Amino acid sequence: NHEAATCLEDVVYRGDMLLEKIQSALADIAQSQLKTR
Amino acid sequence: MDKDQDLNALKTKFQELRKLIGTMPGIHVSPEQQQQQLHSLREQVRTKNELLQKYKSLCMFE
Numbered sequence: 443n444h445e446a447a448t449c450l451e452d453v454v455y456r457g458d459m460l461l462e463k464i465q466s467a468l469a470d471i472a473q474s475q476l477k478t479r
Numbered sequence: 480m481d482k483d484q485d486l487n488a489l490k491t492k493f494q495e496l497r498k499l500i501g502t503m504p505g506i507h508v509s510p511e512q513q514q515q516q517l518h519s520l521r522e523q524v525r526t527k528n529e530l531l532q533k534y535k536s537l538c539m540f541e
Binding site: 478479 | 522523526527530534537540
């Protein structure tokens, strides 16, 4: 169970990094569309 | 005609038609601001195209 929890935590860190990058990209796209309008 | 009928009526009708066509167009102000807005829209379209292109480049997901 500890090994499974460690694997799940690694996957959760990967997913959190991916979500942070996606949010950053979305905010960048939004700011670009705002400044270009 | 006078070198040696209702020509003035037809001329006035043509002038009124030309004025109506000019007012129907929409551009009242000088074309300077129109060209400025067109350049701004072109810049915005270029920015949107560049953003859409850059979006399809960074593809590092699983």
